[PDB]
């Protein structure tokens, strides 16, 4: 996210002091509540803070930070200058950066569930639990690959898709 100093160097606007990028808690609550009633859903409890900011230093053009491969398509963000009556936040642009990936939600549900199965110690033999880890790390490697080949991610996801049995 950018401060107003990015747009107009000689600005009088106060920079964003503290901010919080957040994602919707899709697992807990219903999605159609937010669509119909977006007003009600505007509290920190309903969303999940993926990253925060605190300006413990000099003024800057922008703040940037990495994220842990998130998908949640519905986002919330807050900006606080903390400058008393009439101190409006000014953000020229807000960037959520990543890569295009059809069914990014489905693919990441495969990885997160695969971890939960490897947690289950007394579920399946080591022979099949080891097959899980090799299939999961294959995908996670293609996720955090420097070159972003989607076909390789789709392949490793498809391998890990039917690999999940359950019981």
């Amino acid at each position: 996210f950018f401060n107003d100093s990015a747009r107009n160097p000689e600005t009088t606007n106060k920079p964003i002091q503290e901010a919080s990028l957040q994602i919707f808690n899709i697992k807990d609550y219903n999605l159609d509540n937010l669509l119909e009633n977006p007003n009600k859903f505007d509290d920190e409890k309903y969303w999940i803070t993926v990253d925060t900011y605190s300006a413990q230093g000099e003024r800057a053009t922008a703040f940037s930070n990495t994220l842990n491969n998130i998908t949640s398509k519905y986002w919330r963000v807050v900006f606080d200058t903390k400058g008393d009556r009439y101190s409006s936040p000014v953000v020229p642009e807000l960037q959520i950066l990543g890569y295009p990936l059809p069914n990014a939600d489905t693919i990441m549900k495969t990885v997160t569930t695969a971890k939960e199965l490897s947690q289950q110690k007394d579920k399946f033999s080591q022979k099949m639990l080891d097959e899980l880890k090799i299939k999961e790390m294959a995908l996670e490697t293609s996720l955090n690959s420097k070159i972003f080949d989607v076909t390789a991610i789709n392949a490793n996801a498809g391998v890990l898709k039917d690999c999940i049995e359950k019981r």
């Binding site: 107009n8 000689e10 009088t12 606007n13 009556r85 009439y86 101190s87 409006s88």
Partner: protein, 207 residues
Amino acid sequence: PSVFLFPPKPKDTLMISRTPEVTCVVVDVSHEDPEVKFNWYVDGVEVHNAKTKPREEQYNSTYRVVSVLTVLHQDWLNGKEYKCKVSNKALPAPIEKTISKAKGQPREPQVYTLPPSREEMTKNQVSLTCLVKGFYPSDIAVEWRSNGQPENNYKTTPPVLDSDGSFFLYSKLTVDKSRWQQGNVFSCSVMHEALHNHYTQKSLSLS
């Protein structure tokens, strides 16, 4: 050369989507030396983001060099001194003009919609009134809207100084009697700095 600094429109300063301007007109500008250098300050903080407006098509007589400055809403509402320093070669030393928001304890506008008169019901058109009193400063904006759709045919009186010290004004919405009797909604949309989101509405309908 005479300078004429002018404040922004109330509606612009009370809506963040709109952009307020502090115009600095200069009339009777020297025909011999027509160079005009504007300097813009905001409590000493000289800004350089002004825009000289193109020379409009005045027939003859006197050059009229306008200079606009886009301003922050907060800066106006906080009441910062916008200063327009005009500089002409004919002028021995620069002419400065300063402007700011009205200085005084702000007060909330009590908004009241009044229906047409009992006598006016005989006429084919009626006049929906909107009283707005007890507000300060005079910087205010009012608008009508029928069933969401912004209204065309209405007029608003200037802010008039009340006895206590606050201001007041009325706004006359002229509509057909058909739409009144049928039972539409008409909403007086007052906008003042001492309101929630600088905004408030009062609806009006037949009973």
